[PDB]
């Protein structure tokens with residue numbers, strides 16, 4: 765039903781909220797939730813681990829089946845799998861891990877996957893353990909994505925920095 769509420773307009777197609785993306789997915793029933801994935805679709809921590817836990821491991825079993833046919837995803841790549849109880853679809857997207865020397869330029873590729881979907885509930889890509897500056901990631905999202913993105917940011921201090929950078 766894509767019942768988004770309380771999202772702050774950044775641009776005509778990019779919205780942001782200080783929220784837990786799992787709790788958003790349950791309230792919003794989005795067509796697409798984006799997972800911040802790794803190439804093996806192993807949902808061991810961060811957003812991935814949270815989404816998977818909220819599916820009680822349904823997401824991990826399906827992800828394994830996919831990886832059995834595909835092998836690992838490419839950096840900047842994606843796959844569309846079931847959203848289970850969280851969403852119709854989960855778009856698993858792999859941003860570059862800059863800690864492992866993956867090039868930050870691949871972040872554009874990663875966000876370009878969002879343009880295959882009219883409306884998404886998403887995290888910021890390559891944040892947290894993949895080591896990209898989250899405000900940089902937001903700029904790449906705004907520059908790259910032309911479909912309607914609803915970004916959930918868990919941490920209030922980071923949320924305020926993002927909104928301050930964008931609007932002040």
Ligand SMILES: COc1ccc(C(=O)O)cc1
Nearest residue numbers: 765793794795850851852
């Ligand atoms: C709860 O997540 C969803 C959202 C949309 C749909 C649908 O439109 O079919 C199904 C499940």
